[PDB]
Design a protein around this ligand. Structure first.
Ligand SMILES: O=c1cc(-c2cccc3c2Sc2ccccc2S3)oc(N2CCOCC2)c1
Ligand SMILES: [Zn+2]
Lengths: 134, 1095, 112, 127, 107
């Protein structure tokens, strides 16, 4: 993982989200969560830099995206083996960011990208239905 | 539904879906209490069908009406299902449909909806906006429901009017008991009445049954916040109290278990909700941060503690507090309370004198920071409580400390000026007696105290200017390592401001009519000698004050970057006293050490003053030339085009086939010669590029007027032969200012595309494509036979206003900005500007003859041509008939702009966000244009971004209320016609718009001095040519300059002070007057037909 | 009556201030350098008519206010001021002749 | 005055400034209480009397609740007065009920305030 | 001036501020009297120490309006601030030393 040099806080968060792209049981993320929380408590100046960088387009900032992703992961962990341990790690990570003003109101949930392109590739309103059902 | 014929399936499905949604609204009954999964399934069906294009080939509204639905019921169901943005959109759709149906044949709509459907539109809108969490939108919901005590109490809690909330909670008894008690406890806690709250809680135990969970929650909160360590599904505050108890009792296992339980419970409660708005996450994030800080402190205190560890944890706390700079007080205050409780526990459980002092110092710093934070939010009780706690822990013997200055500031903030001044003067006396400001630790406190006392005395007018100058401000400068530099900068700025005030008073008196009346009366013999003595003394005092102000401004610009924008004022002084040798000497000796980038925002004005009249070592022109040369040396990419434009003022006739102007041209030529002597290649390439642009601008294109596809550039144009300019950055690009002078990784011009396009216009400007070093294409608009310098300076003013708005936290939280675009003039009649992509004129989108929004939607109204003809026919007639004709036109022409956000953004969340951005853009642009007197705001001069829904203002030639001088003058402060308000939603100008207007007007008022000095610098530019002339007036509608200059300055000062028609108004009153003037049909009917007031 | 008189006086004062302002004379000078002249004449006549209407309404309501009580006696000054600056209007003169002659005379004493 | 007051305190043991303040309080003229001097403005008692003179009842609550070194009876008397002047009758009733826990010492002023609150709130049970 | 004087000055200044329209119209009626003769001419100037009239009238009226509104040198002030400014201007020896000896500023 650490080839081509070390990682910054932004790179660590992006790596966490990229791993979160894959869907699996929430408990499998637990260890990674811990790692994230360590980074989040060691690079708060990098957090300041990230927040300053994302102010031009607050909608696609990475700190609100990470918060939403962590909340969704905690939601998927209810009524499972990982509950009460995934929730603790999620709370520890969310306590490292605090109530930062994200300059946004709505939550986007980070919809897929290839699905939208594939839908746009079609037409006739019937091939789109075929693609969705398939 | 696609294959439906005779609308049988449509009728059946409409009836059944309406029955489903009506059944969902009950509360038993025959069918009620439906499962939320079924409601969400039907909501998903409605949401999907809303986005499908109907076979009728209509609009997005028809698409929203695939089925004959009652959207108020659907909106209420969605609100019950926590789809708040969808509920708001459906309520808007329902209101629009009801209005359309009524026209075929909020309060009125709300009462009608309550009549048939039993649902109040106003109440549903209020509930939706409460759920969303946007603070300003809560003000657009007003009517008969604002009189209930609960609504008023929630309003009072919104502005943190805790006294009013306490009074109303104590008064009204019909409120449910639990809500009343919770509100009373919260109001008491927010007022700092801890002992009163404790006794109230003790008295609540009498004649009371088992408490509901909220009551013991508040009891535990008060217990842990008051450090009442005596009394004892666990909730958050109970968990916090138990954790603090365990930390006090050195039982770390229970401490960690309680904190783990609190984290898990908070996360579970947060994740069980719907997660629709970001405002729903903030309290949970605050509680989680508090838990984390407590856990870190417990880990620290588990083992032996050192000074370094406590210093490190306090540094971490300060960093995280810096991250929370823009957060609300409601989210920062609990963290600070937990921090001070933790620090006091550590204080009481130390048993070591050496570390006790370290803990006490940390606690004092934390309490001072808490006092400052509470002061910044207009809270006056918490700072007093913090000062009291400091005094409890910091019984002083020396008598001088940093926290007592904060105590004086707190007393000043409470409008108790005698106490603050007495405290600060006693401290100044003690500091003077103790030492001669030789202690490095006490120097900052002494300097700050002297400066603050001088400023307070200047404000209260309790002391004459001489004593303030000699005893406090100059003393503060003399008394005075980043903290030392900051204190030096502040002292220098304060001294400069006071000296400038005195100098301006002297100048105003010397220019005053009273002085000239006295002189005239004397003109009608020791009196003459006495007057000569007085005049010479006045001139000497004026010169002394001016020199002191200039010197201290220069020293201020050398000590930091927080007051860079004051450079304008400095230049103004230097530009009004060029004949004074002392000012020139100060600018030549110390003014030449100022960093060059700070002079960048004035580069247009400074370069306009170049000449060859005053020479020599102390000559003004030589110093100005040296300054401009050094600035262009350090920042070639921000200055070189301006110098070329000054030198190339008359290159149009050169490329086809006054004393001041000649002097300016020669000075620009010598500056360019110096630049080329250092950088020849770059100068040559930029000159070639400027020649190419100028040649292309003068190329006639009257035979491509109709075509829009794209025309290839003729091969003989030099613009097509420029390739690989490795040192010519793209002129129409915002370049980040570098404090150093390397400018390494900059996108440079690589090529120009062979084809150019026309977008209309009287002079037919040409749109070209520039491909840079990377794979990015930039659109550029090249204009001939037109002056672009006015646009450039107005864009500079817009950038300054943007910086002012970003500076203040209140407008920074709302992202209030002015949309800007880069303008590069090239000659007296040519230039190139950045062509923003995705922008369309509002007139093109609204009143286009072919496919305008007024023709697609509402095709049975008057055409735009009909309205134009009707309003033109009545121009040469009386004003009353103008009024009836305009009202008749407005009756048969209804706004349709609200659909702009509906067509482009089908996701309710994105639609809401874009509409909010649009409203905030309109508010900011309107207020800023009023302050600058910007006019000629017709439909073709305002563009809208199709991606962000924000507004861009172009063609800024008419400003400073010069539009009121034209025949048929402009009688509005800005454009607030029916389409503009209709784009804002159902609340119009009553919600976000009014509050954003008030917030930006307050920003303008708080920075009146800076705005006056900027406008004064820019208006005395000899090249601006801003005044209206008969030729310009005739073209627009198909010394005396000095006097109009001070008249405009006085009017701007009145605007920025709030004085309208002689009456001084608050920000709200001024905004109300402006809005009611802008929306008044009486003024709109008197406007020019080209303005299109009906659109 | 006093409230109506004060509002009408405010409107009249605003119109008079605009007429005696620098912006108005600058606009007139700019126009002095052909239909625009007719538009200016129409606007000037409308402004004068509105000024006269507001002045007459203010004078009438001040007279009525002074006929209905004694709490607002010191407003007679204002009334006289108007009447002293609009001697040739010929409507204020008649309005004072008819209804202003019923005002109790002692109220005019501090203006003698 | 301040120099004269400190010299008088040094030699005779009596300060001029606080004596003048006491005399002006005894006289009862409201304006004269503003020019007595700035020597003893810091003490919470002086600030509380200034607040009560100006009917700044919220500041009176804040300062009475904050300062604990003030003698108890004066503190509760001021708290009750400030609560009554703000219309917080029910808060005052609950506060008086909660004060009954510390009934070991009972000066007549607290009983007088109890009876005043009882008849003003129409309790008809505080016997 | 720190006790009764300052507070009484503030009270009467507040009364003057609350009645600015009445005072303004009274003074406006007074000034346009063709018999008042309130302006200063060189004869009176020489006696005291041993049509521009219209413009002077509006200048005086504007200055009086500024005084009644509390606008001193372009800055609007509260009653207390205006009274403080007036007191510190009147008690200043800097201004007193520049007065006519017949005024007897030392008395
Ligand atoms: O001073 C001007 C004039 C012009 C202009 C000139 C001739 C015709 C037209 C325009 S505007 C326009 C915008 C989108 C679509 C059609 C049109 S028509 O365009 C600009 N800018 C600057 C901001 O970015 C957009 C372009 C500034
Ligand atoms: Zn039911």
């Amino acid at each position: 993982k650490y080839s081509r040099g070390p990682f910054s806080l932004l790179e660590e968060i992006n790596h966490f989200l990229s791993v979160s792209v894959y869907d699996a049981l929430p408990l499998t993320r637990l260890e990674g969560l811990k790692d994230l929380r360590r980074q989040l408590e060691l690079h708060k100046d990098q957090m300041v830099d990230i927040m300053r960088a994302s102010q031009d387009n607050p909608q696609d900032g990475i700190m609100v995206k990470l918060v939403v992703n962590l909340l969704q992961l905690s939601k998927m962990a209810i009524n499972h083996t990982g509950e009460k341990e995934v929730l603790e790690a999620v709370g520890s990570c969310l306590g490292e960011v605090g109530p930062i003003d994200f300059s946004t109101i709505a939550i986007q949930h980070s919809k897929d990208a290839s699905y939208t392109k594939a839908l746009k590739l079609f037409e006739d309103k019937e091939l789109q239905w075929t693609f969705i059902m398939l | 539904l696609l294959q439906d014929t005779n609308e049988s399936w449509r009728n059946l499905l409409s009836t059944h879906v309406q029955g489903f949604f009506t059944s969902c609204l009950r509360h038993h009954f025959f069918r009620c209490c439906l499962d939320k999964k079924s409601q969400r399934t039907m909501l998903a069906v409605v949401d999907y069908m809303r986005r499908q294009k109907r076979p009728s080939s209509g609009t997005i509204f028809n698409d929203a009406f695939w089925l004959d639905l009652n959207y108020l019921e659907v909106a209420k169901v969605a609100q019950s299902c926590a789809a708040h943005f969808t509920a708001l959109l459906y309520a808007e759709i329902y209101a629009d449909k009801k209005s359309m149906d009524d026209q075929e044949k909020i309060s009125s709509l709300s009462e009608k909806s309550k009549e048939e459907t039993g649902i109040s539109l106003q109440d549903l809108l209020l509930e939706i906006y409460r759920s969303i969490g946007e603070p300003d939108s809560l003000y657009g919901c007003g009517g008969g429901k604002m009189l209930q005590p609960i609504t008023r109490l929630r309003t009072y809690e919104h502005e943190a009017m805790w006294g009013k909330a306490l009074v109303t909670y104590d008064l009204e008894t019909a409120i449910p008991s639990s809500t009343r008690q919770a509100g009373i406890i919260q109001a008491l806690q927010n007022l700092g009445l801890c002992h009163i709250l404790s006794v109230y809680l003790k008295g609540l135990d009498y004649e009371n049954k088992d408490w509901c969970p909220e009551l013991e929650e508040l009891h535990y909160q008060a217990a842990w916040r008051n450090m009442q360590w005596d009394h004892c599904g666990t909730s958050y505050h109970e968990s916090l109290y138990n954790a603090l108890q365990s930390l006090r009792d050195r039982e770390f296992s229970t401490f960690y278990e309680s904190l783990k339980y609190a984290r898990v419970k908070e996360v579970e409660e947060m994740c069980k909700r719907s997660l629709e708005s970001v405002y729903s996450l903030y309290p949970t994030l605050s509680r989680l941060q508090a838990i984390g800080e407590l856990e870190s402190i417990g880990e620290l205190f588990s083992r032996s503690v050192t000074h370094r560890q406590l210093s490190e944890v306090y540094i971490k706390w300060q960093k995280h507090s810096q991250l929370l700079k823009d957060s609300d007080f409601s989210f920062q205050e609990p963290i600070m309370a937990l921090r001070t409780v933790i620090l006091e526990i550590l204080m009481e459980k130390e048993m070591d004198n050496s570390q006790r002092e370290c803990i006490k110092d940390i606690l004092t710093k934390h309490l001072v920071e808490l006092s400052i934070l509470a002061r910044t939010f207009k809270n006056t009780q918490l700072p007093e409580r913090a000062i009291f706690q400091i005094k409890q822990y910091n019984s002083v013997s020396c008598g001088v400390s940093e926290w007592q200055l904060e105590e004086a500031q707190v007393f000043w903030a409470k409008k108790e000026q005698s106490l603050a001044l007495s405290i600060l003067k006693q401290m100044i006396k003690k500091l003077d007696a103790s030492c001669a400001a030789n202690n490095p630790s006490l120097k900052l406190t002494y300097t700050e105290c002297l400066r603050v006392c001088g400023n307070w005395l200047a404000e209260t007018c309790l002391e004459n200017p001489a004593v303030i100058m000699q005893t406090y401000l100059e003393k503060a400068v003399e008394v005075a390592s980043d903290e030392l530099r900051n204190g030096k900068m502040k002292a220098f700025l304060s001294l400069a401001r006071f000296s400038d005030t005195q100098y301006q008073r002297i100048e105003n008196y010397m220019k005053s009519s009273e002085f000239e009346n006295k002189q005239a009366l004397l003109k009608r013999q020791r009196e003459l000698e006495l007057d000569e003595l007085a005049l010479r003394a006045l001139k000497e005092d004026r010169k002394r004050f001016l020199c002191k102000a200039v010197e201290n401004y220069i020293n201020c610009l050398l000590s930091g970057e927080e007051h860079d924008m004051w450079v304008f004022r400095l230049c103004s002084l230097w530009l009004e006293n060029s004949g004074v040798s002392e000012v020139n000497g100060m600018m030549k000796r110390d003014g030449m050490k100022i960093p060059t980038y700070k002079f960048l925002p004035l580069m247009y004005q400074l370069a306009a003053r170049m000449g060859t009249k005053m020479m020599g070592g102390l000559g003004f022109h030589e110093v100005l030339n040296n300054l401009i040369s050094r600035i262009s040396m350090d920042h070639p990419h921000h200055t070189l085009f301006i110098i070329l434009a000054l030198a190339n003022a008359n290159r149009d006739e050169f490329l086809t086939k006054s004393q001041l102007d000649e002097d300016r041209t020669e000075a620009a030529n010598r500056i360019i010669c110096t630049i080329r002597s250092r950088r020849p290649q770059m100068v040559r390439s930029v000159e070639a590029l400027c020649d190419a642009y100028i040649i292309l601008a003068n190329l006639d294109a009257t035979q491509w007027k109709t075509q829009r596809k794209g025309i290839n550039i003729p091969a003989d144009q030099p613009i097509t032969k420029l390739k690989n300019l490795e040192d010519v950055v793209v002129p129409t690009m915002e370049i980040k200012v570098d404090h150093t002078g390397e400018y390494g990784n900059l996108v440079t011009i690589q090529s120009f595309k062979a084809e150019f396009r026309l977008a209309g216009g009287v002079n037919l400007p040409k749109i070209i494509d520039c491909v840079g070093s990377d794979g990015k294409e930039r659109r550029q608009l090249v204009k001939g036979r037109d002056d672009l310098r006015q646009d450039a300076v107005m864009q500079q003013v817009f950038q300054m206003c943007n910086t002012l708005l970003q500076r203040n936290t209140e407008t920074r939280k709302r992202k209030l900005t002015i949309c800007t675009y880069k303008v590069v003039p090239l000659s007296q009649r040519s230039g190139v500007l950045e062509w923003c992509t995705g922008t369309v004129p509002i007139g093109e989108f609204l009143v286009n003859n072919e496919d305008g929004a007024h023709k697609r939607y509402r095709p049975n109204d008057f055409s735009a041509f009909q309205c134009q003809k009707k309003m033109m026919e009545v121009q040469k007639k009386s004003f009353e008939e103008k009024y009836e004709v305009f009202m008749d036109v407005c009756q048969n022409f209804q706004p349709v702009f609200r659909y702009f956000c509906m067509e482009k953004f089908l996701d309710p969340a994105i639609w809401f966000e874009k509409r909010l951005a649009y409203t905030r853009s309109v508010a900011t642009s309107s207020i800023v244009g009023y302050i600058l007197g910007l006019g000629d705001r017709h439909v073709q001069n305002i563009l809208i971004n199709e991606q962000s829904a924000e507004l861009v203002h172009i063609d800024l030639g008419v400003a400073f209320e010069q539009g009121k001088i034209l025949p048929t003058p402009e009688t509005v402060p800005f454009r607030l016609t029916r389409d503009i308000v209709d784009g804002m939603g159902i609340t119009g100008v009553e919600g976000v718009f009014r509050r954003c207007c008030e917030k930006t007007m307050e920003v303008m008022r708080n920075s009146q001095e800076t705005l006056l000095t900027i406008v004064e610098v820019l208006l005395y530019d000899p090249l601006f040519d801003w005044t209206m002339n008969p030729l310009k007036a005739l073209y627009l509608q198909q010394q005396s300059f000095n006097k109009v200059a001070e008249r405009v300055l006085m009017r701007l000062q009145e605007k920025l002070k709030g004085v309208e028609e002689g009456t001084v108004l608050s920000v709200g009153g001024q905004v109300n007057l402006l809005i009611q003037q802008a929306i008044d049909p009486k003024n709109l009917s008197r406007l020019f037909p080209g303005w299109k007031a009906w659109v």
